[PDB]
C-alpha cells in the first residue's frame, strides 16, 4: 500500500497565523493527491484536488502545492472556523488510502477551569448506586489532571471522564469526571474531593463535600 504520512498530528494555531501541513507518500503518486477538511460529526469536505487545484466555494486562504512524495496544504492566515481534521488521500493506485490526519486547534489565552462537585442524588442512592460527578468547565489549555480523593486517599478505579470538543464560540474545553460506587462503598467514607491540576495554577483546584452534610 501507499502509506500516507501527515505531520504534525496536531496543531495549536493562533488566528491570523499561517500554517503548512505535510503529507508524504511511501512512493511517488504524481499529482494524485487531495485534501479534505472534516468538522466534528460531519462528512469530509474536499478543499483542493490534484495537489493544487481549487474548488468553487472554498476560501482562497487554502492552497496546496507539492508533487511526487511531498505535499503541502497551506492556510495563509488561519481563521477561527479552520478548526478540524485535515486529511490527505492518494488516488494513484488500489486500494485508496488516506493520511493519519492533522488535527487543527485554535490557541487562546489560558483560562482556569470552573470546578463543581455533586454528591449522589437520593433517588439514585435508592437504586443502591452512587455516582459522584465533577464538572471542569471552560478551560484552556486542554491539559488537565483530575484526581479523586476519598478521605484524603486517592482513588483510580471507578472514574469515567468525558470531554466536550474545543468550543466554537470561546475556544475553551470542558470535562466531566464521574466516580461510580456501590451505595455501601460510599457510606464507608465521609469526604469526597475533586482536584484539578491546570497550568493556570501552581496549587490544585479542590472542591469537596462531606457525605453527611445536608
Amino acid at each position: 500500500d501507499i502509506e500516507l504520512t501527515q505531520s504534525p498530528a496536531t496543531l495549536s494555531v493562533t488566528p491570523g497565523d499561517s500554517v503548512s501541513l505535510s503529507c508524504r507518500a511511501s512512493q511517488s503518486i504524481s499529482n494524485n493527491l487531495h485534501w479534505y477538511q472534516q468538522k466534528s460529526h460531519e462528512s469530509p469536505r474536499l478543499l483542493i484536488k490534484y495537489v493544487s487545484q481549487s474548488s468553487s466555494g472554498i476560501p482562497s486562504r487554502f492552497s496546496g502545492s507539492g508533487s511526487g512524495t511531498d505535499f503541502t496544504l497551506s492556510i495563509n492566515s488561519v481563521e477561527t472556523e479552520d478548526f478540524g481534521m485535515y486529511f490527505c488521500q492518494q488516488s494513484n493506485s488500489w486500494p485508496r488510502t488516506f493520511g493519519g490526519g492533522t488535527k487543527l486547534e485554535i490557541k487562546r489565552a489560558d483560562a482556569a477551569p470552573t470546578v463543581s462537585i455533586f454528591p449522589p442524588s437520593s433517588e439514585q442512592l435508592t437504586s443502591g448506586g452512587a455516582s459522584v460527578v465533577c464538572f471542569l468547565n471552560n478551560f484552556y489549555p486542554k491539559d488537565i489532571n483530575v484526581k479523586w480523593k476519598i478521605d484524603g486517599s486517592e482513588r483510580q478505579n471507578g472514574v469515567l471522564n468525558s470531554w466536550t470538543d474545543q468550543d466554537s464560540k470561546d475556544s475553551t474545553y470542558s470535562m466531566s469526571s464521574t466516580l461510580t460506587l456501590t451505595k455501601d462503598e460510599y457510606e464507608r467514607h465521609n469526604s469526597y474531593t475533586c482536584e484539578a491540576t491546570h497550568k493556570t495554577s501552581t496549587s490544585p483546584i479542590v472542591k469537596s463535600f462531606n457525605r453527611n452534610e445536608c
Binding site: 484536488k49 493520511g99 455533586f118 464538572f135 464521574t178 463535600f209
Partner: protein, 218 residues
C-alpha cells in the same frame, strides 16, 4: 444537485448482518464509481472498496475481502454495502461518496453500533449543588442521564430556553449501557427561586423526562 443520501443509524447484534444504502441523485448513477469509507471513533478514514453501478465490477480493500459486499440497483439509483459477521469492531460511521479520483460528493454517513444490549430507557438524576461550595454568583446545576440504550438521548434545559451555559458531555459506555451528563450555569438569582428543569428524551424507548433540580434540603 448531486445528492447522496444514506440510510439511518443501525444497532445490530454481533454475528448479524447489516445492509447500508446510499441513494444517489442529480447525476447519471451508472456513470460513476461509488466508494465506501469506514471511520472508527478517532482512527483516521479507511477505504473499504467501490462499485460501478453500470457494469457491476467491485473492488474491495484486501482487508475487507469477505466482510463487505457491494451491490447496486440501477432502477432506483441505490448502491448497498452489506456487512457480514458483525463484531464489535465493526462499530463505526460509514460513508459512501462518488468516485472521481477525489471525492467531492459524500453521503451524510451511517452509524453502526454492534451490541447485545437492548432498548433500555435512561434513569435521569438531578444534580443539585452540595450545601458546601455552592455559594457563588453563578451556580452550576447538572443532570445525570444513566444507563440507556441505544444512542441518542436529547437534553435541553427549561424546554430549550436555557441555551447559554449548557455543556452536554459525550456519552460513555458503562457495562454496555450509556451514561451522559449535562451542566447549565446560572446566576444564583434564578435558582432555587426560578424552577430549572432538565428535559431528557429517548426516542428509542419513547421516554420523555422533565426532571426538576430541587434544593438539597432533605
Amino acid at each position: 444537485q448531486v445528492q447522496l443520501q444514506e440510510s439511518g443509524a443501525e444497532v445490530m447484534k454481533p454475528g448479524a448482518s447489516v445492509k447500508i444504502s446510499c441513494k444517489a441523485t442529480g447525476y447519471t448513477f451508472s456513470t460513476y464509481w461509488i466508494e465506501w469509507v469506514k471511520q472508527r471513533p478517532g482512527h483516521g478514514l479507511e477505504w473499504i472498496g467501490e462499485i460501478l453501478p453500470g457494469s457491476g465490477s467491485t473492488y474491495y480493500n484486501e482487508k475487507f475481502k469477505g466482510k463487505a459486499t457491494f451491490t447496486a440497483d440501477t432502477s432506483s439509483n441505490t448502491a448497498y454495502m452489506q456487512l457480514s459477521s458483525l463484531t464489535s469492531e465493526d462499530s463505526a460511521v460509514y460513508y459512501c461518496a462518488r468516485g472521481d479520483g477525489n471525492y467531492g460528493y459524500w453521503g451524510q454517513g451511517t452509524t453502526l453500533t454492534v451490541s447485545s444490549a437492548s432498548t433500555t430507557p435512561p434513569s435521569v438524576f438531578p444534580l443539585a449543588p452540595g450545601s458546601a461550595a455552592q455559594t457563588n454568583s453563578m451556580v452550576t446545576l447538572g443532570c445525570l442521564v444513566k444507563g440507556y440504550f441505544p444512542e441518542p438521548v436529547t437534553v435541553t434545559w427549561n424546554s430549550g430556553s436555557l441555551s447559554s451555559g449548557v455543556h452536554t458531555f459525550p456519552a460513555v459506555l458503562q457495562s454496555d449501557l450509556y451514561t451522559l451528563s449535562s451542566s447549565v450555569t446560572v446566576p444564583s438569582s434564578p435558582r432555587p427561586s426560578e424552577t430549572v428543569t432538565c428535559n431528557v428524551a429517548h426516542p428509542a424507548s419513547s421516554t420523555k423526562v422533565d426532571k426538576k433540580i430541587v434544593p438539597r434540603d432533605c
